[PDB]
């Protein structure tokens, strides 16, 4: 939801800048955060409303 | 000269100049610039050609 740098690769010669981050139609209103969910220790694909 | 007998192993003698924290024998000093994303194994071209 808020873009993470997380190193940089070089482009055509040039040091440049790598962001990880969702695609548009993953992050455009309060219901999308349905669409996100995050391993556990147990390994289960855990729902942020949880 | 007496050098100038080592195998592979350019020994050459030389003395200081005038100012030594100055410039040198009126010759040039060119640097060739890559302008595009043209890579070393490019430029190195380039400066061979030249």
Redesign the interface.
Known sequence: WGGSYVNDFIDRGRVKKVYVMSEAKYRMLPDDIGDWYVRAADGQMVPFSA | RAFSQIKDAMVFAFNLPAIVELGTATGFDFELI?Q????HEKLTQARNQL
């Open positions: 890559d595009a994303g043209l890579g």
